[PDB]
């Protein structure tokens, strides 16, 4: 199921920038999956009163209930859902792939048109998912990041007693103000009890949106049923691709971007031959623990749309087109599909 | 290290005098040091494959005979053709500069052949034999002196490495005479391909022969360290960003060291280590020279990466380089981590139940400052590639090898013709060498270590209370909000000179902002000078722009601060008043601040030189709380009252003559134009450019076709040559440059450039240095003869630095990616209007001619808004004669309207436009020339084009009629 949650205004995902006295200027980033799921959990808790302490997990970092990840989405004429753009994709929407030559002992990672490319910004649509994971990207299937939503800026002042303004008492932010019929969606495991309708505040300044529970479209049923063609693909050819849509803490104790095979012994992957992994600068956050009201420990993640090329001897073995990866998996972390490369 | 001096020393000085006893002119200059017969066959075959992109040039097509170059005329005709006297053509732009002076002094004869059959020639020959005798004997006594001088062969190597080329040109100075000298130092290593000197074709000869001695194979080694931008980018104070920069540059000084230590100076290409401040710092270390130049070590001139060549046995080899490398920096970063916690983390606090508590949260700490950068040392193999057998099978073979590996059909053609084109040389011994896909080896490292920096790799910290500058590393002390303030404000006590009350710093924040306190005492840098700068405010910097008397707000300032004098006296008494007034200010402080004897006390004994520049703004003096707010101290006295207004009516005298303290200054930074390009060749001219003078003529119609065409590639030599370029462009020159336009120089590494200016001159400086970077010959000095992309704003002293670096490095990306070879100027005043417009740089000159017609009131300063106004609805059909007619009617009519209407179709001429889709042809084409007339002409939409070119070229030109 998901949850179409159409803002009412601009809202404000803070950065982890400290709003000192001096320090009063604020910048707003993308939004991460612990906010979301962080008022997902508030929202349901506050409702039912302190008896569901365990299925929101109160106290503890994880929930019991889960959330696979966020897509964005919009309303051109259809109900359609986007994911970030795939690191590997180049601004003339051509595939990156490694070109692996032996005889100089290098493993160059060259685009197909020269050894030099950008990735290209934007939103890849969740209809060209399938056709990207098969290595078919269309043209039709992208689209830029200015047409969904660009940042605006305001200024705040705190007045003093009568009139004039107050000491220390001057600030200015800078939120993210959606374009018309563009929202969030918030993607849930079934079965997980939630009111239909309301309102639910995201977001720091307290700001708030109109939530509407919504069963899965088809793009997401078309995927799971075409999973199985691409897993038997992925296992003729011997190298899978791993594309991920949400940030990962993949890291270890001590976060990192090693991918350690451990995890991917489980998928049913028996010798990784090698491992090519493009992506981009990490990602550090932290949140505010309302139980301690504390900040939490930092953490560093891999950025959404980061690629891993893997040649693997063996078989995959899920039934599933997508994998969780990492620690704080249910919050909707680590969402990783994975396709033939 | 004897085997080096050797391989260094392989080729005589004067070898372009005469070619003719060559080897035994080197033999006899090197003397007992002389190589044997096994050193001087490796020697030769290193030599063979330095430069061998151009060493192959033994076309001896003009009837049967090799050419030949050399100043002297007695070459045989028969097996020798004489071609000409030697030039020096520009390793990139291929300028050629003459030997004017070396050819006065040189034997003057009439016969331009003088066969050693001929006549009218033994004169001649007299003077050439006593010219090569005199110039022999001085470098025979150059090197005896560095002989002597020195015992130890590697410190000798070293010394000689360094400082040959000086001491020869010095004693040579008074042989002929200075020109003399200077034309003398510049000797092409061969007359036939002259694009570089023999310097560095002898260095880079002998960085290979270090390479491949006792067997080790070479492999190119490329090192950098990430992230930059964001350490520099969280800053409050001009003296945090000196520091970080110095940071940085010390950080990556440690390990070109260790390798330059490790196996020789001459192993690192770029960059050119030959002149650095650090280098010359770094022997005085070493014991070897005297040298030490205190000012020139405050700038951080080192870059942040660095490209070495170095010869190895195995991957554990390699494996072990690393080791070393992040052994020596780990343990800097830890000395320095130490020494800031014994001095001040233990200093300020005491035996408390805080530092109980803190405890081992030290080391932790400690690890999150040690993992906080990435170092990446991404390493590729030579390969050697069979050319035994016929030159024609070598070729092939090395063309299948070239062909075997798979690449993109741009790079494989190019490569293909580079290889074509070397081996089109009808001879016996065309054999190629490995080192002509030297090109090739280098590009595809530099892609590789990208991807070897994406990998972070950071630790794990637990809950707490973040740091006010970062915002993302724990503070030093954050599980608790009270111990956190109490150390902070204890520690902020305890020094108010480097932080105030109301901040936290992680560990990397606070080694940054004591770093000017240990800089000093670091082994690096004692017994060299003066390392910190003095600017600590860039209201210094706003207030150094010169005012209508001349005097500018800086030395009144610092008569107040009684640090230097002042020339004027015509407000001598008004100095006076303003300095009594300080004083009395600061001793009334003293005495309330020594009361409680919160501050330490000498801040305060200090305070009488450290009164903040602040105090000199009228506006900063309006209350009592705001003067003690100013002056730093926090305000949580009628006498004082009756002081600020004493002071008050004292400033208002000075203020009414030189006027109010400028508030505001030019933030300037400058990128190279993707130097990339061109070390892959993609910018290279063809080798036509590159030839003695006329060559081609001489030479078969195959070969010349070739050489036609082709591009040229780059070689070791010619590599060296342009590291030591623009080596010459980032330290010789630009310190001056921006001496004389009164700013302040952060960070010159390489072709990055980082300043902080004056408004009053900053778009000269801005234009000089764009052309001291587009010239190829500065006299006898050589210049990088390349583009750069700029970054310019415009800001008053209030915004945070962080978010003026941010904006900054904003507006140089968008010039860079707007098409390069602009500066992409900015406004931003306090109220918070932003206006930004990116142009060539040659248009600075057509806006400063319109805002020097609008200052002499030739022309009403009303023609802008109307303009403005109209440019929404103004198409390329119309504007002209409207703007002449508006020119005809807002002027003073007389020839001052037309030569206002001329200059503005240039400035709007110069203009970058960014549209939406193919801004790509058209912005390449604007910063092409006379094309953007044509092209514009026929293109699609033709008209937004012109809106927004109106548009810009009236927003740069409203800003610099401000100033």
Same mark, same amino acid.
Request: proline share 4%; with cysteine; aromatic share 10%.
């Given at each position: 199921m998901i949850?179409v949650?159409?803002?009412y205004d601009?809202?404000?995902?803070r950065?982890?920038?400290?709003?000192?006295?001096?320090?009063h200027?604020?910048?707003?980033?993308?939004?991460?999956?612990?906010?979301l799921?962080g008022?997902?959990?508030?929202a349901?808790?506050?409702?039912?009163?302190?008896?569901?302490?365990?299925?929101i997990?109160?106290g503890?970092?994880?929930?019991?209930?889960?959330?696979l990840?966020?897509?964005?989405y919009?309303?051109d004429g259809?109900f359609?859902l986007l994911?970030?753009?795939?690191?590997d994709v180049?601004?003339?929407?051509?595939?990156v792939?490694?070109?692996r030559?032996?005889?100089?002992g290098?493993?160059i990672?060259?685009?197909?048109?020269?050894?030099?490319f950008?990735?290209?910004n934007?939103?890849?649509?969740?209809?060209?998912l399938?056709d990207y994971?098969?290595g078919?990207?269309?043209?039709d299937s992208?689209?830029?990041?200015?047409?969904?939503?660009?940042?605006?800026?305001r200024?705040?002042i705190?007045?003093?007693?009568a009139?004039?303004?107050?000491?220390?008492h001057?600030?200015?932010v800078?939120?993210?103000?959606?374009?018309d019929?563009?929202?969030i969606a918030?993607?849930?495991?079934?079965?997980?009890?939630?009111?239909?309708?309301?309102i639910?505040?995201?977001?720091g300044?307290?700001?708030?949106?109109?939530?509407?529970?919504?069963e899965?479209?088809?793009?997401?049923?078309?995927?799971?049923?075409k999973?199985?063609k691409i897993?038997?693909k992925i296992?003729?050819?011997?190298?899978?691709?791993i594309?991920?849509?949400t940030?990962?803490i993949?890291?270890?104790?001590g976060?990192s971007?090693?991918?350690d095979?451990d995890?991917?012994?489980?998928?049913?992957?028996?010798r990784?031959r090698?491992?090519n992994f493009?992506?981009?600068?990490?990602?550090?956050?932290s949140?505010?623990?309302?139980?301690?009201?504390?900040?939490?420990?930092?953490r560093?993640?891999?950025?959404a749309?980061?690629?891993?090329?893997?040649?693997?001897?063996?078989?995959?073995?899920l039934?599933?087109?997508y994998?969780?990866l990492?620690?704080?998996?249910?919050?909707?972390?680590?969402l990783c599909?994975?396709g033939?490369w | 290290?004897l085997?080096k001096?050797?391989a260094?020393?392989?080729?005589?000085?004067?070898?372009?005098?005469?070619?003719?006893?060559h080897?035994?002119?080197?033999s006899f200059?090197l003397?007992?040091?002389?190589?044997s017969?096994?050193?001087?066959?490796?020697?030769?075959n290193?030599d063979?494959?330095?430069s061998?992109?151009?060493r192959?040039?033994l076309?001896?097509?003009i009837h049967?005979?090799?050419?030949?170059?050399t100043?002297?005329?007695?070459?045989?005709?028969?097996?020798?053709?004489?071609?000409?006297q030697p030039?020096?053509?520009?390793?990139?732009?291929?300028?050629?500069k003459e030997?004017g002076?070396?050819?006065?002094?040189l034997?003057?004869?009439?016969?331009e052949?003088?066969?050693?059959?001929?006549?009218?020639?033994?004169?001649?020959?007299?003077?050439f034999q006593e010219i090569?005798?005199?110039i022999?004997?001085?470098?025979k006594?150059?090197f005896?002196?560095?002989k002597?001088?020195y015992?130890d062969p590697k410190?000798?190597?070293?010394?000689?490495?360094?400082f040959?080329?000086?001491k020869?040109?010095?004693?040579?100075?008074?042989?002929?005479?200075?020109?003399?000298? @200077?034309?003398f130092?510049?000797l092409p290593?061969?007359?036939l391909?002259?694009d570089h000197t023999?310097f560095?074709?002898a260095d880079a000869?002998?960085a290979?022969?270090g390479?491949?001695?006792?067997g080790?194979?070479?492999?190119?080694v490329?090192?950098?360290?990430?992230?930059?931008q964001?350490?520099?980018?969280?800053?409050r104070?001009?003296?945090?960003l000196?520091?970080?920069?110095?940071m940085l540059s010390?950080?990556?000084?440690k390990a070109i060291?260790?390798?330059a230590?490790?196996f020789?100076?001459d192993?690192?290409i770029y960059?050119?280590?030959?002149?650095?401040?650090?280098?010359h710092?770094?022997?005085?270390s070493?014991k070897?020279?005297?040298?030490s130049?205190?000012?020139?070590?405050?700038?951080?001139?080192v870059?942040?990466?660095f490209?070495?060549?170095?010869?190895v046995?195995?991957?554990?080899?390699?494996?072990?380089?690393?080791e070393?490398?992040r052994?020596?920096?780990?343990?800097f970063?830890?000395?320095?981590?130490?020494?800031?916690?014994?001095?001040?983390?233990v200093?300020?606090?005491?035996?408390s139940?805080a530092?109980?508590?803190?405890?081992?949260k030290?080391?932790?700490?400690?690890?999150?400052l040690l993992?906080?950068?990435?170092?990446?040392?991404?390493?590729?193999?030579?390969?050697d590639?069979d050319?035994?057998?016929?030159k024609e099978?070598a070729?092939?073979?090395?063309?299948?090898?070239?062909?075997?590996?798979?690449?993109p059909?741009?790079?494989e053609?190019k490569?293909?013709?580079?290889?074509?084109?070397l081996?089109?040389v009808?001879?016996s011994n065309n054999?190629?060498?490995?080192?002509?896909?030297?090109s090739?080896?280098?590009?595809?490292?530099?892609?590789?270590?990208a991807?070897?920096?994406?990998?972070?790799?950071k630790?794990?910290?637990?809950?707490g209370?973040k740091?006010?500058?970062?915002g993302?590393?724990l503070a030093?002390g954050?599980?608790?909000?009270?111990?956190m303030?109490?150390v902070?404000?204890?520690?902020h006590?305890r020094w108010?000179?480097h932080?105030?009350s109301?901040?936290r710093?992680?560990?990397?924040?606070?080694?940054?902002?004591f770093?000017?306190?240990?800089?000093e005492?670091?082994?690096?840098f004692?017994?060299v000078?003066?390392?910190?700068?003095?600017?600590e405010?860039?209201?210094?910097?706003?207030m150094?722009?010169?005012?209508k008397?001349?005097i500018?707000?800086?030395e009144v300032?610092?008569y107040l601060?009684?640090?230097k004098?002042?020339?004027?006296?015509?407000?001598?008494?008004?100095?006076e008043?303003?300095?009594?007034?300080?004083?009395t200010?600061?001793?009334?402080v003293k005495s309330e601040?020594?009361s409680?004897?919160v501050?330490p006390?000498?801040?305060l004994?200090?305070?009488?030189?450290?009164?903040?520049?602040?105090?000199?703004?009228?506006?900063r003096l309006?209350?009592?709380?705001?003067?003690?707010?100013?002056?730093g101290?926090d305000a949580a006295?009628?006498?004082?009252?009756?002081?600020?207004?004493?002071?008050?009516?004292?400033?208002s005298?000075?203020?009414?003559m030189?006027?109010?303290?400028?508030?505001?200054?030019?933030i300037?930074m400058?990128?190279?134009?993707?130097?990339?390009?061109?070390l892959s060749?993609?910018?290279?001219?063809?080798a @036509?450019?590159?030839l003695?003078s006329?060559?081609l003529?001489?030479?078969?119609?195959?070969?010349?076709?070739k050489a036609?065409?082709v591009?040229?590639?780059?070689?070791?030599?010619?590599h060296?040559?342009?590291?030591?370029?623009?080596?010459?462009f980032?330290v010789?020159?630009?310190?001056?440059?921006?001496?004389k336009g009164?700013?302040?120089l952060?960070?010159s590494?390489?072709?990055?450039?980082?300043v902080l200016?004056?408004?009053?001159?900053?778009?000269?400086?801005?234009?000089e240095?764009?052309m001291?970077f587009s010239?190829?010959?500065n006299?006898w000095?050589?210049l990088?003869?390349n583009?750069?992309?700029?970054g310019?704003?415009?800001?008053?002293?209030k915004?945070?630095?962080?978010?003026?670096?941010?904006?900054t490095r904003?507006l140089?990306?968008?010039?860079?990616?707007?098409?390069?070879?602009?500066?992409?100027?900015g406004?931003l005043?306090?109220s918070?209007?932003?206006?930004?417009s990116v142009?060539?740089?040659?248009?600075?000159?057509?806006?400063?001619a319109?805002?020097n017609?609008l200052?002499k009131?030739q022309?009403?300063?009303?023609?802008?808004y @109307?303009?403005?106004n109209?440019?929404?609805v103004?198409?390329?059909?119309?504007?002209h004669?409207?703007?002449?007619?508006?020119?005809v009617?807002?002027?003073?009519?007389?020839n001052?309207?037309?030569?206002?209407q001329?200059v503005f179709?240039?400035?709007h001429?110069?203009?970058?436009?960014?549209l939406?889709?193919?801004?790509?042809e058209?912005?390449?084409y604007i910063?092409?020339?006379?094309?953007?007339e044509?092209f514009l002409?026929?293109?699609e939409?033709?008209?937004?084009?012109?809106?927004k070119?109106?548009?810009g070229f009236?927003?740069?030109?409203?800003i610099?009629y401000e100033?």
């Amino acid at each position: 199921m998901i949850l179409v949650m159409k803002p009412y205004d601009s809202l404000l995902f803070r950065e982890p920038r400290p709003f000192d006295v001096n320090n009063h200027v604020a910048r707003t980033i993308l939004p991460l999956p612990q906010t979301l799921a962080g008022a997902v959990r508030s929202a349901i808790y506050v409702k039912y009163g302190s008896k569901v302490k365990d299925l929101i997990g109160f106290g503890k970092e994880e929930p019991e209930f889960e959330i696979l990840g966020h897509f964005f989405y919009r309303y051109d004429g259809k109900f359609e859902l986007l994911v970030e753009s795939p690191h590997d994709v180049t601004q003339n929407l051509g595939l990156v792939k490694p070109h692996r030559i032996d005889k100089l002992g290098i493993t160059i990672l060259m685009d197909s048109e020269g050894i030099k490319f950008r990735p290209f910004n934007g939103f890849l649509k969740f209809s060209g998912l399938i056709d990207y994971l098969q290595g078919r990207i269309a043209e039709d299937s992208v689209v830029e990041r200015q047409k969904i939503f660009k940042k605006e800026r305001r200024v705040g002042i705190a007045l003093t007693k009568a009139k004039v303004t107050k000491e220390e008492h001057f600030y200015q932010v800078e939120m993210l103000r959606f374009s018309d019929d563009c929202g969030i969606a918030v993607w849930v495991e079934d079965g997980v009890d939630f009111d239909d309708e309301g309102i639910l505040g995201v977001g720091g300044e307290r700001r708030f949106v109109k939530f509407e529970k919504r069963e899965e479209p088809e793009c997401i049923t078309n995927l799971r049923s075409k999973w199985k063609k691409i897993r038997d693909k992925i296992n003729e050819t011997g190298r899978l691709k791993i594309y991920l849509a949400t940030p990962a803490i993949l890291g270890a104790k001590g976060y990192s971007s090693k991918l350690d095979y451990d995890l991917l012994g489980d998928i049913g992957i028996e010798r990784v031959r090698s491992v090519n992994f493009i992506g981009g600068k990490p990602v550090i956050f932290s949140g505010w623990d309302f139980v301690t009201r504390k900040p939490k420990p930092t953490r560093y993640a891999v950025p959404a749309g980061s690629v891993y090329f893997v040649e693997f001897e063996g078989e995959v073995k899920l039934d599933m087109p997508y994998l969780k990866l990492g620690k704080l998996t249910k919050l909707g972390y680590g969402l990783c599909f994975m396709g033939v490369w | 290290w004897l085997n080096k001096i050797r391989a260094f020393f392989h080729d005589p000085p004067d070898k372009s005098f005469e070619l003719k006893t060559h080897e035994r002119r080197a033999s006899f200059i090197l003397g007992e040091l002389k190589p044997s017969k096994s050193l001087k066959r490796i020697i030769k075959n290193a030599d063979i494959q330095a430069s061998s992109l151009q060493r192959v040039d033994l076309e001896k097509s003009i009837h049967k005979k090799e050419l030949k170059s050399t100043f002297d005329r007695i070459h045989n005709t028969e097996k020798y053709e004489y071609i000409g006297q030697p030039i020096i053509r520009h390793p990139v732009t291929g300028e050629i500069k003459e030997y004017g002076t070396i050819l006065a002094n040189l034997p003057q004869t009439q016969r331009e052949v003088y066969d050693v059959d001929d006549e009218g020639k033994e004169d001649y020959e007299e003077q050439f034999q006593e010219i090569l005798s005199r110039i022999l004997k001085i470098e025979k006594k150059v090197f005896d002196d560095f002989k002597n001088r020195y015992s130890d062969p590697k410190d000798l190597y070293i010394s000689l490495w360094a400082f040959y080329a000086e001491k020869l040109k010095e004693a040579l100075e008074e042989e002929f005479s200075a020109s003399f000298a @200077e034309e003398f130092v510049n000797l092409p290593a061969y007359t036939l391909s002259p694009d570089h000197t023999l310097f560095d074709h002898a260095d880079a000869t002998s960085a290979i022969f270090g390479a491949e001695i006792d067997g080790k194979k070479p492999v190119l080694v490329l090192f950098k360290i990430s992230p930059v931008q964001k350490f520099i980018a969280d800053a409050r104070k001009e003296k945090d960003l000196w520091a970080a920069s110095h940071m940085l540059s010390t950080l990556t000084f440690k390990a070109i060291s260790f390798i330059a230590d490790k196996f020789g100076p001459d192993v690192v290409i770029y960059p050119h280590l030959r002149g650095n401040p650090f280098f010359h710092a770094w022997l005085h270390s070493k014991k070897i020279w005297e040298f030490s130049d205190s000012h020139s070590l405050k700038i951080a001139s080192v870059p942040n990466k660095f490209l070495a060549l170095v010869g190895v046995s195995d991957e554990k080899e390699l494996n072990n380089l690393r080791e070393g490398i992040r052994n020596e920096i780990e343990s800097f970063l830890a000395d320095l981590f130490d020494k800031l916690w014994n001095e001040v983390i233990v200093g300020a606090l005491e035996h408390s139940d805080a530092l109980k508590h803190l405890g081992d949260k030290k080391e932790i700490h400690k690890e999150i400052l040690l993992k906080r950068f990435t170092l990446t040392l991404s390493s590729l193999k030579i390969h050697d590639v069979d050319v035994s057998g016929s030159k024609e099978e070598a070729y092939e073979k090395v063309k299948d090898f070239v062909r075997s590996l798979g690449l993109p059909n741009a790079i494989e053609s190019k490569y293909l013709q580079w290889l074509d084109m070397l081996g089109s040389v009808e001879a016996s011994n065309n054999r190629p060498t490995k080192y002509d896909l030297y090109s090739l080896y280098y590009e595809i490292l530099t892609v590789l270590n990208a991807i070897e920096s994406t990998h972070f790799d950071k630790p794990a910290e637990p809950a707490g209370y973040k740091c006010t500058l970062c915002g993302e590393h724990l503070a030093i002390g954050g599980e608790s909000r009270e111990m956190m303030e109490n150390v902070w404000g204890k520690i902020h006590k305890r020094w108010p000179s480097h932080l105030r009350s109301n901040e936290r710093l992680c560990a990397v924040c606070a080694v940054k902002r004591f770093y000017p306190k240990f800089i000093e005492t670091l082994d690096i840098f004692e017994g060299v000078g003066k390392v910190v700068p003095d600017i600590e405010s860039v209201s210094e910097v706003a207030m150094c722009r010169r005012t209508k008397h001349g005097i500018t707000w800086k030395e009144v300032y610092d008569y107040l601060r009684g640090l230097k004098n002042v020339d004027d006296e015509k407000l001598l008494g008004k100095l006076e008043n303003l300095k009594h007034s300080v004083q009395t200010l600061i001793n009334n402080v003293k005495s309330e601040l020594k009361s409680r004897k919160v501050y330490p006390e000498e801040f305060l004994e200090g305070l009488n030189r450290n009164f903040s520049n602040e105090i000199l703004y009228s506006e900063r003096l309006r209350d009592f709380n705001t003067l003690l707010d100013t002056l730093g101290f926090d305000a949580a006295v009628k006498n004082y009252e009756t002081m600020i207004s004493e002071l008050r009516e004292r400033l208002s005298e000075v203020y009414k003559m030189l006027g109010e303290p400028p508030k505001y200054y030019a933030i300037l930074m400058m990128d190279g134009d993707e130097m990339g390009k061109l070390l892959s060749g993609e910018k290279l001219k063809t080798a @036509e450019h590159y030839l003695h003078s006329a060559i081609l003529e001489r030479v078969s119609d195959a070969l010349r076709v070739k050489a036609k065409t082709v591009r040229r590639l780059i070689t070791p030599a010619a590599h060296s040559s342009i590291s030591r370029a623009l080596k010459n462009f980032s330290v010789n020159h630009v310190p001056d440059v921006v001496r004389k336009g009164n700013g302040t120089l952060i960070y010159s590494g390489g072709d990055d450039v980082l300043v902080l200016l004056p408004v009053d001159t900053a778009f000269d400086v801005a234009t000089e240095l764009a052309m001291t970077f587009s010239t190829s010959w500065n006299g006898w000095e050589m210049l990088p003869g390349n583009k750069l992309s700029a970054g310019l704003l415009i800001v008053h002293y209030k915004h945070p630095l962080y978010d003026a670096l941010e904006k900054t490095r904003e507006l140089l990306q968008k010039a860079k990616k707007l098409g390069r070879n602009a500066i992409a100027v900015g406004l931003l005043k306090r109220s918070g209007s932003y206006y930004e417009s990116v142009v060539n740089f040659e248009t600075l000159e057509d806006a400063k001619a319109v805002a020097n017609l609008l200052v002499k009131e030739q022309v009403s300063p009303r023609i802008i808004y @109307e303009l403005l106004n109209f440019a929404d609805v103004i198409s390329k059909e119309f504007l002209h004669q409207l703007v002449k007619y508006e020119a005809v009617r807002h002027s003073i009519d007389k020839n001052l309207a037309e030569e206002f209407q001329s200059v503005f179709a240039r400035g709007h001429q110069g203009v970058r436009v960014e549209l939406e889709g193919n801004d790509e042809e058209i912005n390449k084409y604007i910063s092409d020339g006379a094309n953007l007339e044509t092209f514009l002409d026929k293109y699609e939409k033709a008209v937004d084009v012109i809106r927004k070119q109106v548009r810009g070229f009236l927003n740069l030109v409203k800003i610099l009629y401000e100033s």
